[PDB]
Ligand binder design. Structure first.
Ligand SMILES: *[C@@H]1O[C@H](CO)[C@@H](O[C@@H]2O[C@H](CO)[C@@H](O[C@@H]3O[C@H](CO[C@H]4O[C@H](CO)[C@@H](O)[C@H](O)[C@@H]4O)[C@@H](O)[C@H](O[C@H]4O[C@H](CO)[C@@H](O)[C@H](O)[C@@H]4O)[C@@H]3O)[C@H](O)[C@H]2NC(C)=O)[C@H](O)[C@H]1NC(C)=O
Ligand SMILES: *[C@@H]1O[C@H](CO)[C@@H](O[C@@H]2O[C@H](CO)[C@@H](O[C@@H]3O[C@H](CO[C@H]4O[C@H](CO)[C@@H](O)[C@H](O)[C@@H]4O)[C@@H](O)[C@H](O[C@H]4O[C@H](CO)[C@@H](O)[C@H](O)[C@@H]4O)[C@@H]3O)[C@H](O)[C@H]2NC(C)=O)[C@H](O)[C@H]1NC(C)=O
Lengths: 105, 438, 438
């Protein structure tokens, strides 16, 4: 018989009815490593923990590119005006901006 | 004094209400509901028993003919037959060979023992909920009953409580009730004047002892075969004894919210749904003044076990600094954990324990002893069981709010990744003004 | 055979319903309501009488003292005094000067005629309307009663009827009801356990005979004066004798839709609201086949009088070409006029008389006698009497059809300038097609 959380009653033959509720045990391990803390929230709510971890995963790879896309935009606005006219690339900036006009460019 | 609270509708579960006013000591309460039985406003529409086909001895007149009388009974069926020859036990019967009629009649009425066992068809359109509440404070310990609507008022010690209207309006009775002995069948029985032979309600009388019986059981006669003094009749059998054995289960055995269903003033007791608003009218002769209450300072809380078990898994060693022996009234203020015994005593050295029951990995609640507050913290562990006979004693709140292990790794990632997205926005202001001005 | 109709709810108003089918003569019915009750679904909140305060004989004590008792009683109040000097009739009575107390005691209960006269307080949440329709067709008049909701089913002769639900669900009561002897009062009474002194509900008991009386009539028990033997007190007066005078009217004298309000099985009989749907089940052995009916050809009607009076103030005359005498059934295919008597007897000569009743200046009703139709038009005149003692037999409709004299002048103004408006368009169409191109 599936005893989910709110319990069942069941009557066998002519005995009085018996009610049995479900405890809130699990299989994982709380208060430990970040990889074994997901298994603790996996026996508890096994289908509502994938939609939670994906929005905590999509918020990481999106916010990581949007800092580098602002890096490459801000890198461009310091290398371009020293690349139109014939002139040196000022190696003071080479230590900061690892400029693609390195050696013969 | 006036105070409002909303107890849950769980049978056999204590609730703590806490009263704080000016000048007096903080005082807790403990309301507990014992039984809850709602009944609809019934009205009997008909009564069904077995039937009893009465038929008298047949009449044979052999000198001449006869005619039917055509009286009025429920299923009064006369039919006269032509020339017969009865063949009684000694020789012939009526000393001729033809020209002899035979008047045969039969009809139906209500059973003999109908007032003892009988089905009844009521109607459920409203409801009327009653309850039974144990009220506890100080040295007052009583138990009363009151209608759960905003018009009834009970007095217990010197106060005047009033229980508000129910949140929901849910009844497991659909509209209609069929009671036989100890059981309600959630049916859609045919109305008075639409009986069907074999299905339920072929005998419908308006009440138990009245007249005007209604019956259509298709009582059709036939002629006797050749030479026997009998009377044949064919009709569909008793519908009421179909229903005693064809009944699967009552509404008792499939009611939604754990309800059980009794029968004599037809009702459905101990149903756990919704919540009850209350209204309190405790006078000022029950409180204690802050002069006589022991002033308690320098609170501290620490735990040792915190099991997720349903009863009271978790101990809490709690210290303080008092001056006078007296009496306090503990309480929490958050629905993450619940506190037992509500009124624990005091001692000069601060060493008293508590039994909480939380249901999350890291609870964070707050305790007031005698207007003297603190917070608590725990590192709870799961229990090694699966099926428990008793029921829960905690409000469900699974959220490790702002300090646990499951929160610290979230704050380091989102406080470490977010610090490098806005840092590129700083570089987007740092460089672009220098280029543009140059 | 099956047929449905709807009848208006006004009492003493014969309605006609028409039945047409292939292979039989047309047939008309005559439904006519004769009474209508409306019982709410009661439940006695409480019942109210006129109380009786019993002051027993005061018990003195001449040397010792006495103490209070704390008995169990509705508004019990006893309290003892200090030394009093009684001085009854001849000389003193305790023969001391002090230390002789006099215990006083008083309480209240219900009356002695409380089972005879009483106000009864009910609650009206639902209501079940009955009716007393009589049914007329052919040579059959019966009169049956039925609960007016769409499932109860009654039989008349050899046919069966049922009556649908009432259109609205309006009540002349409200959810509160006060029943004394012949006058239900639609007043929101104060609830149980919250009675107020002086106003209606000072004493309250749950049913007619029970314990647990409730009362707060503000009984105060003052101190006896100088040397006479009497127990004085003071009390707010009986509320129920104020409510017998300060009752303004009944609800019979301010009921909304003109409905008398009886009292003993609390009722609301003969209202006037909405309409009632019906359902017919006339079997095939009630019509006439089309061969047996008298054939009717070449109808032509011609009005004579037509006043607007509330009775049948109109006489028409019809001609025809029949072939055999018989009995037709007339009907009106409009809600403008209602032909009376429905059951004319056709003869050899082509001349019959009817009686109709309109409410507008020009009718357009059309008459079927026996599967043959014609149209009637009249020029009608208003009556002279202003106040009439009987009701209204027509339907409330005031609109001349299309060819009345009051509307003929409209078409001689509409076609006049409307035909001149298109003529002013047709000039511009010619100009904007000849000298937009030349
Ligand atoms: C005033 O307020 C107090 C507390 O607020 C209430 O006191 C409690 O009342 C309940 C019920 O009356 C008491 O429960 C009873 O306990 C008895 C002894 O308990 C021992 O045995 C049980 C059973 O193994 C153990 O679980 C427990 O730990 C103890 O070891 C039981 O013997 C009683 O059972 C009886 O009744 C049941 C059905 O009711 C029968 O089936 C049994 O056969 C037996 O007859 C019962 O369980 C409880 O002990 C009281 N005290 C406390 C501190 O909770 C008062 O009810 C309340 N009102 C008054 C005084 O009017
Ligand atoms: C259809 O169904 C009914 C079954 O009852 C039958 O027709 C009914 O016949 C009865 C009499 O047999 C009618 O009842 C009485 O009619 C009397 C005759 O009315 C004359 O007098 C009055 C009064 O002056 C005039 O207005 C009228 O024009 C006639 O000249 C009435 O005098 C009776 O009055 C009673 O009630 C009034 C209150 O209304 C009291 O004040 C009186 O004192 C008295 O008690 C009464 O009305 C009845 O009206 C008929 N019902 C109909 C026609 O629907 C038929 O037999 C049946 N049809 C067939 C084919 O069988």
């Amino acid at each position: 018989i599936p005893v989910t959380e709110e319990g069942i009653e069941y009557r066998w033959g002519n005995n009085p009815p018996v009610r049995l509720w479900a405890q809130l045990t699990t299989e994982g391990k709380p208060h430990g490593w970040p990889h074994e803390i997901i298994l603790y929230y996996y026996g508890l709510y096994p289908a509502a923990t994938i939609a939670a971890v994906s929005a905590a995963g999509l918020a990481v790879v999106l916010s990581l590119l949007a800092s580098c896309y602002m890096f490459a935009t801000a890198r461009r606005k310091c290398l371009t005006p020293y690349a139109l006219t014939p002139g040196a690339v000022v190696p003071v900036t080479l230590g900061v901006l690892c400029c693609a006009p390195r050696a013969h460019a | 004094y006036e105070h409002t609270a909303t107890i849950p509708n769980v049978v056999g579960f204590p609730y703590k209400a806490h009263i704080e006013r000016n000048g007096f000591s903080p005082m807790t309460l403990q309301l507990e509901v014992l039984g809850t039985s709602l009944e609809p406003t019934l009205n009997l529409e008909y009564i069904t028993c077995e039937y009893k086909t009465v038929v008298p001895s047949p009449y044979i007149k052999c000198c001449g003919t006869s005619e039917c009388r055509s009286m009025e009974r429920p299923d009064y069926q006369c039919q006269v037959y032509t020339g017969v020859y009865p063949f009684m036990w000694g020789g012939a019967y009526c000393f001729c060979d033809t020209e002899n009629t035979q008047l045969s009649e039969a009809y139906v009425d209500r059973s003999d023992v109908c007032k003892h066992d009988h089905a009844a068809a009521y109607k459920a359109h409203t409801a009327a909920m009653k309850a039974t509440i144990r009220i506890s404070y100080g040295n007052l310990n009583q138990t009363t009953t009151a209608f759960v609507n905003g018009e009834h008022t009970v007095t217990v010690g010197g106060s005047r409580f009033t229980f508000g209207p129910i949140s929901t309006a849910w009844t497991p009775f659909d509209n209609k009730i069929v009671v036989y002995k100890n059981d309600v069948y959630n049916q859609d029985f045919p109305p008075y004047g639409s009986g069907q032979p074999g299905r339920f309600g072929d005998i419908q009388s308006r009440t138990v002892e009245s007249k005007d019986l209604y019956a259509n059981t298709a009582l059709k006669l036939s002629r006797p075969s050749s030479g026997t003094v009998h009377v044949p009749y064919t009709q569909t059998p008793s519908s009421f004894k179909y229903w005693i054995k064809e009944r699967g289960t009552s509404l008792n055995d499939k009611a939604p919210f754990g309800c059980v269903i009794k029968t004599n003033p037809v009702r459905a007791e101990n149903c756990a749904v919704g919540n009850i608003p209350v209204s309190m009218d405790i006078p000022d002769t029950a409180f204690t003044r802050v002069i006589d209450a022991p002033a308690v300072t320098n609170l501290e809380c620490q735990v040792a076990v915190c099991t997720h078990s349903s009863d009271f898994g978790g101990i809490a060693t709690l210290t303080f600094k008092t001056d006078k022996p007296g009496k306090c009234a503990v309480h929490s203020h958050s629905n993450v954990a619940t506190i037992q015994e509500a009124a624990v005593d005091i001692k000069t050295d601060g060493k008293i324990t508590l039994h909480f029951s939380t249901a999350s990995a890291s609870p964070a609640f707050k305790v007031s002893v005698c207007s003297a507050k603190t917070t608590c913290m725990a590192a709870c562990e799961p229990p090694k069981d699966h099926i428990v006979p008793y029921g829960a004693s905690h409000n469900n709140q699974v959220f490790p709010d702002m300090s646990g292990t499951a929160m610290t790794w979230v704050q380091r990632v989102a406080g470490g990744l977010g610090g490098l997205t806005l840092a590129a926005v700083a570089v987007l202001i740092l460089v672009t003004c220098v280029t543009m001005r140059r």
